[PDB]
Amino acid sequence: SRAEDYEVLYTIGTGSYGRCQKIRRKSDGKILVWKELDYGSMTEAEKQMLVSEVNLLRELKHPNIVRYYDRIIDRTNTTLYIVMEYCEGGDLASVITKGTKERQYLDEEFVLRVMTQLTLALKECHRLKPANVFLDGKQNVKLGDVGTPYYMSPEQMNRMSYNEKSDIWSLGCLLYELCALMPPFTAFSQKELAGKIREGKFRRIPYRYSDELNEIITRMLNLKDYHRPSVEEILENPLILEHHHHHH
Ligand SMILES: */C=C\c1nc(Nc2ccc(S(N)(=O)=O)cc2)nc2nc[nH]c12
Ligand SMILES: [Cl-]
Ligand SMILES: [Cl-]
Ligand code: NA
C-alpha cells in the first residue's frame, strides 16, 4: 500500500515512462518489481485512462503473463508505483545476446517452449519484442509490459488492419529471431525495412532447426493474414507437447 513498506534493491532498467526496479517487501521479504510512472503532468482525465488500464491489468491472472499485484501512490510526490511479479530469468533479448556472444544457437526445445507459452499468453489476451518477454526461475515464459519497428506487420504499414493475425506475425518475427539470432527483415532505413517486409522474403532459419519448426514460423510470417495460423491452429501443431507448457 505504501512505498515505505518496500526496499528498492536496484534498478533493472529505465524503459519508457520511467523505471523498473527490483524491490523487496519488508513484511515477508518477497521479491517483486515496481514500475515508476510520473503522474506529474497528467490530467484529471489522463489519470482516469491510467486507472482504467491498471484495473484492466489487475484483472489478468495467467501463468504466462507477468502478474500485477498492487498499485501505490506517493505524496512526496507525483509518482505511481505499479507492483508486479519479478521474473528471475531475465528477458529474451539477453538470451539472444548471449547466444550471439557464445556463438551458440538456442535449443529447438526452448524455441518450442517460447512458441507454446507466448501463444497461450496471446490467447488469453484475445479475451511484442524480445525485451518485453521474460523468463521465470524454470525458464517458463511470461509476456510483460526512435527504434526500427522490426516486427511491424505488412497490413499495419499499409494501415489496413490490426487484428489477431498481426499479433501472429509479430510472434513469427520473435521466434524467427530466437532461431536465427537476427530478425527476419533487417535494414538501415525504415523505408528499406518497409520494402523488405512488403516483399515477405527471408532466409530459412538455421538448418539445425527442424523443417516442421521452420514451416510453422514461416506460416506465421505469411504476407496474407488469413494464411497465418490462429492461436488454436498453432497449439494443434504436433511439435507442441505437454513439456513445452508452463510448469510451477
Ligand atoms: C523491468 C523489467 C522486468 N524485469 C524482470 N526481471 C529481470 C529482467 C532482466 C534481468 S537481467 N537483464 O539482469 O539479466 C533480470 C531479471 N522482471 C520483471 N517483472 C516485471 N517487469 C520486469
Ligand atoms: Cl552463431
Ligand atoms: Cl541459413
Ligand atoms: Na539472470
PDB file of C-alpha atoms and ligand atoms in Angstrom:
ATOM      1  CA  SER A   1       0.000   0.000   0.000  1.00  0.00           C
ATOM      2  CA  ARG A   2       2.792   2.430   0.945  1.00  0.00           C
ATOM      3  CA  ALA A   3       6.153   2.780  -0.789  1.00  0.00           C
ATOM      4  CA  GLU A   4       7.770   2.742   2.672  1.00  0.00           C
ATOM      5  CA  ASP A   5       6.742  -0.929   3.012  1.00  0.00           C
ATOM      6  CA  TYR A   6       9.358  -1.918   0.406  1.00  0.00           C
ATOM      7  CA  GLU A   7      13.096  -1.537  -0.021  1.00  0.00           C
ATOM      8  CA  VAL A   8      14.472  -0.919  -3.504  1.00  0.00           C
ATOM      9  CA  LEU A   9      17.213  -3.422  -4.283  1.00  0.00           C
ATOM     10  CA  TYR A  10      18.240  -1.878  -7.583  1.00  0.00           C
ATOM     11  CA  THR A  11      17.168  -0.529 -10.959  1.00  0.00           C
ATOM     12  CA  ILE A  12      16.659  -3.199 -13.606  1.00  0.00           C
ATOM     13  CA  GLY A  13      16.089  -0.758 -16.449  1.00  0.00           C
ATOM     14  CA  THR A  14      14.853   2.679 -17.423  1.00  0.00           C
ATOM     15  CA  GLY A  15      12.458   1.839 -20.243  1.00  0.00           C
ATOM     16  CA  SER A  16       9.656   4.087 -21.430  1.00  0.00           C
ATOM     17  CA  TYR A  17       7.671   6.179 -18.905  1.00  0.00           C
ATOM     18  CA  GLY A  18      10.098   5.646 -16.023  1.00  0.00           C
ATOM     19  CA  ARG A  19      11.983   2.958 -14.139  1.00  0.00           C
ATOM     20  CA  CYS A  20      11.850  -0.860 -13.259  1.00  0.00           C
ATOM     21  CA  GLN A  21      13.022  -1.543 -10.060  1.00  0.00           C
ATOM     22  CA  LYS A  22      13.722  -4.783  -8.173  1.00  0.00           C
ATOM     23  CA  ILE A  23      12.240  -4.325  -4.684  1.00  0.00           C
ATOM     24  CA  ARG A  24      11.728  -6.388  -1.536  1.00  0.00           C
ATOM     25  CA  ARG A  25       8.625  -6.331   0.666  1.00  0.00           C
ATOM     26  CA  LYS A  26       9.718  -5.704   4.247  1.00  0.00           C
ATOM     27  CA  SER A  27       6.904  -7.720   5.834  1.00  0.00           C
ATOM     28  CA  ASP A  28       7.882 -11.126   4.405  1.00  0.00           C
ATOM     29  CA  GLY A  29      10.909 -10.398   2.213  1.00  0.00           C
ATOM     30  CA  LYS A  30       9.032 -11.138  -1.012  1.00  0.00           C
ATOM     31  CA  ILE A  31      10.989 -10.164  -4.138  1.00  0.00           C
ATOM     32  CA  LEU A  32       8.969  -8.046  -6.570  1.00  0.00           C
ATOM     33  CA  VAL A  33       9.405  -5.233  -9.040  1.00  0.00           C
ATOM     34  CA  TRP A  34       7.598  -1.974  -9.463  1.00  0.00           C
ATOM     35  CA  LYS A  35       7.319   0.415 -12.383  1.00  0.00           C
ATOM     36  CA  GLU A  36       7.633   4.149 -11.637  1.00  0.00           C
ATOM     37  CA  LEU A  37       5.182   6.372 -13.529  1.00  0.00           C
ATOM     38  CA  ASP A  38       5.376  10.141 -13.061  1.00  0.00           C
ATOM     39  CA  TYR A  39       1.712  11.148 -12.900  1.00  0.00           C
ATOM     40  CA  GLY A  40       3.136  14.698 -12.835  1.00  0.00           C
ATOM     41  CA  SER A  41       1.783  16.341 -15.968  1.00  0.00           C
ATOM     42  CA  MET A  42      -1.321  14.176 -16.371  1.00  0.00           C
ATOM     43  CA  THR A  43      -4.918  15.393 -16.417  1.00  0.00           C
ATOM     44  CA  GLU A  44      -7.811  14.558 -14.145  1.00  0.00           C
ATOM     45  CA  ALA A  45      -8.880  12.596 -17.256  1.00  0.00           C
ATOM     46  CA  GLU A  46      -5.484  11.222 -18.317  1.00  0.00           C
ATOM     47  CA  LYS A  47      -5.252   9.846 -14.784  1.00  0.00           C
ATOM     48  CA  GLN A  48      -8.637   8.233 -15.470  1.00  0.00           C
ATOM     49  CA  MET A  49      -7.302   6.408 -18.531  1.00  0.00           C
ATOM     50  CA  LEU A  50      -4.336   5.250 -16.447  1.00  0.00           C
ATOM     51  CA  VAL A  51      -6.648   3.990 -13.689  1.00  0.00           C
ATOM     52  CA  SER A  52      -8.791   2.108 -16.203  1.00  0.00           C
ATOM     53  CA  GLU A  53      -5.680   0.487 -17.673  1.00  0.00           C
ATOM     54  CA  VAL A  54      -4.366  -0.515 -14.245  1.00  0.00           C
ATOM     55  CA  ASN A  55      -7.727  -2.034 -13.304  1.00  0.00           C
ATOM     56  CA  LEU A  56      -7.715  -3.992 -16.570  1.00  0.00           C
ATOM     57  CA  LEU A  57      -4.226  -5.323 -15.829  1.00  0.00           C
ATOM     58  CA  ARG A  58      -5.263  -6.191 -12.270  1.00  0.00           C
ATOM     59  CA  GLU A  59      -7.910  -8.376 -13.919  1.00  0.00           C
ATOM     60  CA  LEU A  60      -5.415 -10.624 -15.730  1.00  0.00           C
ATOM     61  CA  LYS A  61      -4.321 -13.848 -13.999  1.00  0.00           C
ATOM     62  CA  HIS A  62      -2.382 -16.174 -16.310  1.00  0.00           C
ATOM     63  CA  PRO A  63       0.852 -18.095 -15.634  1.00  0.00           C
ATOM     64  CA  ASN A  64       2.433 -16.833 -18.892  1.00  0.00           C
ATOM     65  CA  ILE A  65       1.648 -13.147 -18.222  1.00  0.00           C
ATOM     66  CA  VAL A  66       3.570 -11.056 -15.699  1.00  0.00           C
ATOM     67  CA  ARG A  67       1.257 -10.839 -12.690  1.00  0.00           C
ATOM     68  CA  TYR A  68       0.036  -7.490 -11.386  1.00  0.00           C
ATOM     69  CA  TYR A  69      -0.041  -7.261  -7.606  1.00  0.00           C
ATOM     70  CA  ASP A  70      -0.543  -3.723  -6.350  1.00  0.00           C
ATOM     71  CA  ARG A  71      -0.548  -0.022  -7.119  1.00  0.00           C
ATOM     72  CA  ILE A  72       0.984   2.575  -4.803  1.00  0.00           C
ATOM     73  CA  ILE A  73       0.520   6.351  -4.749  1.00  0.00           C
ATOM     74  CA  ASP A  74       3.258   8.651  -3.499  1.00  0.00           C
ATOM     75  CA  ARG A  75       2.773  12.001  -1.803  1.00  0.00           C
ATOM     76  CA  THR A  76       6.312  13.396  -1.954  1.00  0.00           C
ATOM     77  CA  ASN A  77       5.237  13.166  -4.772  1.00  0.00           C
ATOM     78  CA  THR A  78       3.787  12.692  -8.291  1.00  0.00           C
ATOM     79  CA  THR A  79       4.714   9.008  -8.645  1.00  0.00           C
ATOM     80  CA  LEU A  80       2.590   5.906  -9.202  1.00  0.00           C
ATOM     81  CA  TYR A  81       4.167   2.540  -8.387  1.00  0.00           C
ATOM     82  CA  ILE A  82       2.793  -0.488 -10.221  1.00  0.00           C
ATOM     83  CA  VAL A  83       3.867  -3.565  -8.284  1.00  0.00           C
ATOM     84  CA  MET A  84       4.435  -6.723 -10.328  1.00  0.00           C
ATOM     85  CA  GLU A  85       5.935 -10.187 -10.299  1.00  0.00           C
ATOM     86  CA  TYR A  86       9.718 -10.371 -10.677  1.00  0.00           C
ATOM     87  CA  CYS A  87      10.965 -12.725 -13.405  1.00  0.00           C
ATOM     88  CA  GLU A  88      14.327 -14.027 -12.248  1.00  0.00           C
ATOM     89  CA  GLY A  89      15.353 -15.397 -15.663  1.00  0.00           C
ATOM     90  CA  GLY A  90      15.684 -12.038 -17.378  1.00  0.00           C
ATOM     91  CA  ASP A  91      14.380 -11.184 -20.823  1.00  0.00           C
ATOM     92  CA  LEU A  92      14.700 -12.872 -24.210  1.00  0.00           C
ATOM     93  CA  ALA A  93      16.866 -10.038 -25.559  1.00  0.00           C
ATOM     94  CA  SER A  94      19.635 -11.126 -23.168  1.00  0.00           C
ATOM     95  CA  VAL A  95      19.220 -14.774 -24.158  1.00  0.00           C
ATOM     96  CA  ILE A  96      19.709 -13.737 -27.798  1.00  0.00           C
ATOM     97  CA  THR A  97      22.721 -11.567 -26.944  1.00  0.00           C
ATOM     98  CA  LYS A  98      24.288 -14.475 -25.040  1.00  0.00           C
ATOM     99  CA  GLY A  99      23.707 -16.913 -27.890  1.00  0.00           C
ATOM    100  CA  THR A 100      25.421 -14.454 -30.211  1.00  0.00           C
ATOM    101  CA  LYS A 101      28.417 -13.930 -27.912  1.00  0.00           C
ATOM    102  CA  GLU A 102      28.786 -17.657 -27.253  1.00  0.00           C
ATOM    103  CA  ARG A 103      28.351 -18.361 -30.983  1.00  0.00           C
ATOM    104  CA  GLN A 104      25.674 -20.787 -29.769  1.00  0.00           C
ATOM    105  CA  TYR A 105      22.227 -21.203 -31.323  1.00  0.00           C
ATOM    106  CA  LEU A 106      19.319 -21.796 -28.941  1.00  0.00           C
ATOM    107  CA  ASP A 107      17.883 -25.277 -28.435  1.00  0.00           C
ATOM    108  CA  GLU A 108      14.853 -26.084 -30.568  1.00  0.00           C
ATOM    109  CA  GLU A 109      13.075 -27.245 -27.398  1.00  0.00           C
ATOM    110  CA  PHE A 110      13.485 -23.762 -25.887  1.00  0.00           C
ATOM    111  CA  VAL A 111      12.101 -22.122 -29.033  1.00  0.00           C
ATOM    112  CA  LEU A 112       9.118 -24.504 -28.878  1.00  0.00           C
ATOM    113  CA  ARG A 113       8.547 -23.586 -25.242  1.00  0.00           C
ATOM    114  CA  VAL A 114       8.539 -19.889 -26.131  1.00  0.00           C
ATOM    115  CA  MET A 115       6.166 -20.520 -29.032  1.00  0.00           C
ATOM    116  CA  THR A 116       3.736 -22.550 -26.893  1.00  0.00           C
ATOM    117  CA  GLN A 117       3.678 -20.282 -23.842  1.00  0.00           C
ATOM    118  CA  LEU A 118       3.571 -16.997 -25.782  1.00  0.00           C
ATOM    119  CA  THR A 119       0.753 -18.359 -27.940  1.00  0.00           C
ATOM    120  CA  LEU A 120      -1.173 -19.228 -24.784  1.00  0.00           C
ATOM    121  CA  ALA A 121      -0.472 -15.758 -23.361  1.00  0.00           C
ATOM    122  CA  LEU A 122      -1.800 -14.199 -26.579  1.00  0.00           C
ATOM    123  CA  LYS A 123      -4.864 -16.461 -26.493  1.00  0.00           C
ATOM    124  CA  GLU A 124      -5.598 -15.149 -23.004  1.00  0.00           C
ATOM    125  CA  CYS A 125      -5.034 -11.562 -24.174  1.00  0.00           C
ATOM    126  CA  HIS A 126      -7.516 -12.089 -27.029  1.00  0.00           C
ATOM    127  CA  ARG A 127     -10.234 -12.443 -24.372  1.00  0.00           C
ATOM    128  CA  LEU A 128       5.794  -7.951 -28.690  1.00  0.00           C
ATOM    129  CA  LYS A 129       9.591  -7.761 -28.705  1.00  0.00           C
ATOM    130  CA  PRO A 130      12.340  -9.782 -27.023  1.00  0.00           C
ATOM    131  CA  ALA A 131      12.959  -7.162 -24.327  1.00  0.00           C
ATOM    132  CA  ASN A 132       9.267  -7.448 -23.311  1.00  0.00           C
ATOM    133  CA  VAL A 133       9.320 -11.251 -22.866  1.00  0.00           C
ATOM    134  CA  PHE A 134      10.670 -12.611 -19.585  1.00  0.00           C
ATOM    135  CA  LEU A 135      11.693 -15.938 -18.076  1.00  0.00           C
ATOM    136  CA  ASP A 136      10.937 -17.130 -14.550  1.00  0.00           C
ATOM    137  CA  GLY A 137      13.138 -19.437 -12.475  1.00  0.00           C
ATOM    138  CA  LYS A 138      12.231 -22.534 -14.504  1.00  0.00           C
ATOM    139  CA  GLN A 139      12.550 -20.827 -17.908  1.00  0.00           C
ATOM    140  CA  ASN A 140       8.780 -20.519 -18.162  1.00  0.00           C
ATOM    141  CA  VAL A 141       7.836 -17.637 -20.465  1.00  0.00           C
ATOM    142  CA  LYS A 142       5.979 -14.515 -19.292  1.00  0.00           C
ATOM    143  CA  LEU A 143       4.635 -11.745 -21.504  1.00  0.00           C
ATOM    144  CA  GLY A 144       5.318  -8.366 -19.902  1.00  0.00           C
ATOM    145  CA  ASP A 145       4.631  -4.674 -20.450  1.00  0.00           C
ATOM    146  CA  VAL A 146      13.037   6.181 -32.275  1.00  0.00           C
ATOM    147  CA  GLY A 147      13.699   2.495 -32.913  1.00  0.00           C
ATOM    148  CA  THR A 148      13.361   0.351 -36.011  1.00  0.00           C
ATOM    149  CA  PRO A 149       9.968  -1.471 -35.938  1.00  0.00           C
ATOM    150  CA  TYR A 150      11.442  -4.814 -36.963  1.00  0.00           C
ATOM    151  CA  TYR A 151       8.194  -6.655 -36.175  1.00  0.00           C
ATOM    152  CA  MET A 152       5.692  -4.336 -37.899  1.00  0.00           C
ATOM    153  CA  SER A 153       3.324  -6.480 -39.967  1.00  0.00           C
ATOM    154  CA  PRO A 154       2.548  -5.672 -43.619  1.00  0.00           C
ATOM    155  CA  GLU A 155      -1.116  -4.786 -43.111  1.00  0.00           C
ATOM    156  CA  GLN A 156      -0.277  -2.335 -40.313  1.00  0.00           C
ATOM    157  CA  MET A 157       2.218  -0.479 -42.523  1.00  0.00           C
ATOM    158  CA  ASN A 158      -0.430  -0.332 -45.252  1.00  0.00           C
ATOM    159  CA  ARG A 159      -2.728   0.975 -42.462  1.00  0.00           C
ATOM    160  CA  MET A 160      -5.115  -1.845 -43.431  1.00  0.00           C
ATOM    161  CA  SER A 161      -5.852  -3.512 -40.104  1.00  0.00           C
ATOM    162  CA  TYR A 162      -4.600  -4.572 -36.681  1.00  0.00           C
ATOM    163  CA  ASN A 163      -6.064  -7.969 -35.785  1.00  0.00           C
ATOM    164  CA  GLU A 164      -5.162 -11.231 -34.013  1.00  0.00           C
ATOM    165  CA  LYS A 165      -3.193 -12.145 -37.131  1.00  0.00           C
ATOM    166  CA  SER A 166      -0.931  -9.104 -36.755  1.00  0.00           C
ATOM    167  CA  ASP A 167      -0.009 -10.451 -33.321  1.00  0.00           C
ATOM    168  CA  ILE A 168       0.726 -13.766 -35.025  1.00  0.00           C
ATOM    169  CA  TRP A 169       3.091 -12.033 -37.463  1.00  0.00           C
ATOM    170  CA  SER A 170       4.902 -10.381 -34.552  1.00  0.00           C
ATOM    171  CA  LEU A 171       5.239 -13.725 -32.766  1.00  0.00           C
ATOM    172  CA  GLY A 172       6.647 -15.121 -36.003  1.00  0.00           C
ATOM    173  CA  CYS A 173       9.334 -12.437 -36.068  1.00  0.00           C
ATOM    174  CA  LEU A 174      10.200 -13.109 -32.422  1.00  0.00           C
ATOM    175  CA  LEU A 175      10.543 -16.877 -32.882  1.00  0.00           C
ATOM    176  CA  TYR A 176      12.498 -16.292 -36.084  1.00  0.00           C
ATOM    177  CA  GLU A 177      14.919 -14.063 -34.216  1.00  0.00           C
ATOM    178  CA  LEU A 178      15.237 -16.633 -31.426  1.00  0.00           C
ATOM    179  CA  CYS A 179      16.241 -19.187 -34.067  1.00  0.00           C
ATOM    180  CA  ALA A 180      18.478 -17.072 -36.323  1.00  0.00           C
ATOM    181  CA  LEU A 181      19.655 -14.599 -33.654  1.00  0.00           C
ATOM    182  CA  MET A 182      18.600 -11.894 -36.129  1.00  0.00           C
ATOM    183  CA  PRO A 183      15.185 -10.529 -37.181  1.00  0.00           C
ATOM    184  CA  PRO A 184      13.723 -11.866 -40.450  1.00  0.00           C
ATOM    185  CA  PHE A 185      13.930  -8.429 -42.097  1.00  0.00           C
ATOM    186  CA  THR A 186      16.870  -6.107 -41.450  1.00  0.00           C
ATOM    187  CA  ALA A 187      17.638  -2.676 -42.879  1.00  0.00           C
ATOM    188  CA  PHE A 188      19.375   0.625 -42.129  1.00  0.00           C
ATOM    189  CA  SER A 189      16.385   2.706 -43.269  1.00  0.00           C
ATOM    190  CA  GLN A 190      12.749   2.309 -42.276  1.00  0.00           C
ATOM    191  CA  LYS A 191      11.727   2.686 -45.928  1.00  0.00           C
ATOM    192  CA  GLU A 192      14.090  -0.128 -46.901  1.00  0.00           C
ATOM    193  CA  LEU A 193      12.641  -2.109 -43.988  1.00  0.00           C
ATOM    194  CA  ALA A 194       9.113  -1.442 -45.259  1.00  0.00           C
ATOM    195  CA  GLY A 195      10.091  -2.687 -48.707  1.00  0.00           C
ATOM    196  CA  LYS A 196      11.585  -5.864 -47.270  1.00  0.00           C
ATOM    197  CA  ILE A 197       8.515  -6.510 -45.100  1.00  0.00           C
ATOM    198  CA  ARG A 198       6.209  -5.958 -48.082  1.00  0.00           C
ATOM    199  CA  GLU A 199       8.268  -8.387 -50.174  1.00  0.00           C
ATOM    200  CA  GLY A 200       7.930 -11.006 -47.430  1.00  0.00           C
ATOM    201  CA  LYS A 201      11.155 -12.879 -48.254  1.00  0.00           C
ATOM    202  CA  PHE A 202      13.664 -14.025 -45.646  1.00  0.00           C
ATOM    203  CA  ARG A 203      16.343 -16.639 -45.124  1.00  0.00           C
ATOM    204  CA  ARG A 204      15.430 -20.035 -43.763  1.00  0.00           C
ATOM    205  CA  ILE A 205      16.112 -20.399 -40.050  1.00  0.00           C
ATOM    206  CA  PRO A 206      19.365 -22.320 -39.457  1.00  0.00           C
ATOM    207  CA  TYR A 207      19.411 -25.896 -40.727  1.00  0.00           C
ATOM    208  CA  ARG A 208      19.870 -27.279 -37.201  1.00  0.00           C
ATOM    209  CA  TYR A 209      16.164 -26.472 -36.725  1.00  0.00           C
ATOM    210  CA  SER A 210      13.503 -28.890 -37.918  1.00  0.00           C
ATOM    211  CA  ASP A 211      11.591 -28.416 -41.154  1.00  0.00           C
ATOM    212  CA  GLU A 212       8.402 -28.526 -39.064  1.00  0.00           C
ATOM    213  CA  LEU A 213       9.525 -25.622 -36.870  1.00  0.00           C
ATOM    214  CA  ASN A 214      10.612 -23.702 -39.959  1.00  0.00           C
ATOM    215  CA  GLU A 215       7.202 -24.387 -41.504  1.00  0.00           C
ATOM    216  CA  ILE A 216       5.194 -23.035 -38.579  1.00  0.00           C
ATOM    217  CA  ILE A 217       7.374 -19.930 -38.184  1.00  0.00           C
ATOM    218  CA  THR A 218       7.161 -19.286 -41.930  1.00  0.00           C
ATOM    219  CA  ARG A 219       3.373 -19.657 -41.886  1.00  0.00           C
ATOM    220  CA  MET A 220       3.199 -17.027 -39.151  1.00  0.00           C
ATOM    221  CA  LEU A 221       5.181 -14.749 -41.488  1.00  0.00           C
ATOM    222  CA  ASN A 222       2.770 -15.102 -44.414  1.00  0.00           C
ATOM    223  CA  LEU A 223       2.075 -11.838 -46.222  1.00  0.00           C
ATOM    224  CA  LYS A 224      -1.674 -12.603 -46.065  1.00  0.00           C
ATOM    225  CA  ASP A 225      -3.080 -12.504 -42.543  1.00  0.00           C
ATOM    226  CA  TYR A 226      -5.759 -15.044 -43.491  1.00  0.00           C
ATOM    227  CA  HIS A 227      -2.975 -17.523 -44.295  1.00  0.00           C
ATOM    228  CA  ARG A 228      -1.424 -17.099 -40.871  1.00  0.00           C
ATOM    229  CA  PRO A 229      -2.483 -19.724 -38.315  1.00  0.00           C
ATOM    230  CA  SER A 230      -4.689 -18.832 -35.384  1.00  0.00           C
ATOM    231  CA  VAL A 231      -3.543 -19.474 -31.813  1.00  0.00           C
ATOM    232  CA  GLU A 232      -5.679 -22.619 -31.899  1.00  0.00           C
ATOM    233  CA  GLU A 233      -4.039 -23.924 -35.076  1.00  0.00           C
ATOM    234  CA  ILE A 234      -0.620 -23.171 -33.593  1.00  0.00           C
ATOM    235  CA  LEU A 235      -1.431 -25.130 -30.442  1.00  0.00           C
ATOM    236  CA  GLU A 236      -2.712 -28.031 -32.598  1.00  0.00           C
ATOM    237  CA  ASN A 237       0.723 -28.455 -34.209  1.00  0.00           C
ATOM    238  CA  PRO A 238       2.263 -31.894 -33.463  1.00  0.00           C
ATOM    239  CA  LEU A 239       5.521 -30.161 -32.473  1.00  0.00           C
ATOM    240  CA  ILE A 240       3.866 -28.770 -29.346  1.00  0.00           C
ATOM    241  CA  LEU A 241       3.813 -31.196 -26.415  1.00  0.00           C
ATOM    242  CA  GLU A 242       2.998 -31.124 -22.709  1.00  0.00           C
ATOM    243  CA  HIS A 243       6.561 -30.401 -21.597  1.00  0.00           C
ATOM    244  CA  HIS A 244       6.625 -27.190 -23.671  1.00  0.00           C
ATOM    245  CA  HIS A 245       3.924 -25.694 -21.430  1.00  0.00           C
ATOM    246  CA  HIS A 246       4.413 -23.794 -18.187  1.00  0.00           C
ATOM    247  CA  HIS A 247       5.169 -25.780 -15.025  1.00  0.00           C
ATOM    248  CA  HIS A 248       5.275 -24.355 -11.497  1.00  0.00           C
TER     249      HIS A 248
HETATM  250  C1  LIG B   1      11.807  -4.013 -15.996  1.00  0.00           C
HETATM  251  C2  LIG B   1      11.805  -5.284 -16.337  1.00  0.00           C
HETATM  252  C3  LIG B   1      11.468  -6.525 -15.518  1.00  0.00           C
HETATM  253  N1  LIG B   1      12.458  -7.399 -15.333  1.00  0.00           N
HETATM  254  C4  LIG B   1      12.255  -8.539 -14.676  1.00  0.00           C
HETATM  255  N2  LIG B   1      13.322  -9.491 -14.443  1.00  0.00           N
HETATM  256  C5  LIG B   1      14.668  -9.358 -14.968  1.00  0.00           C
HETATM  257  C6  LIG B   1      14.952  -8.633 -16.111  1.00  0.00           C
HETATM  258  C7  LIG B   1      16.256  -8.554 -16.568  1.00  0.00           C
HETATM  259  C8  LIG B   1      17.269  -9.214 -15.882  1.00  0.00           C
HETATM  260  S1  LIG B   1      18.973  -9.109 -16.498  1.00  0.00           S
HETATM  261  N3  LIG B   1      18.940  -8.193 -17.928  1.00  0.00           N
HETATM  262  O1  LIG B   1      19.890  -8.580 -15.489  1.00  0.00           O
HETATM  263  O2  LIG B   1      19.513 -10.449 -16.778  1.00  0.00           O
HETATM  264  C9  LIG B   1      16.981  -9.949 -14.750  1.00  0.00           C
HETATM  265  C10 LIG B   1      15.679 -10.019 -14.294  1.00  0.00           C
HETATM  266  N4  LIG B   1      11.073  -8.847 -14.187  1.00  0.00           N
HETATM  267  C11 LIG B   1      10.013  -8.021 -14.350  1.00  0.00           C
HETATM  268  N5  LIG B   1       8.719  -8.110 -13.962  1.00  0.00           N
HETATM  269  C12 LIG B   1       8.097  -7.013 -14.387  1.00  0.00           C
HETATM  270  N6  LIG B   1       8.948  -6.233 -15.039  1.00  0.00           N
HETATM  271  C13 LIG B   1      10.167  -6.842 -15.035  1.00  0.00           C
HETATM  272 CL    CL B   2      26.268 -18.387 -34.449  1.00  0.00          CL
HETATM  273 CL    CL B   3      20.573 -20.252 -43.450  1.00  0.00          CL
HETATM  274 NA    NA B   4      19.830 -13.641 -14.903  1.00  0.00          NA
END
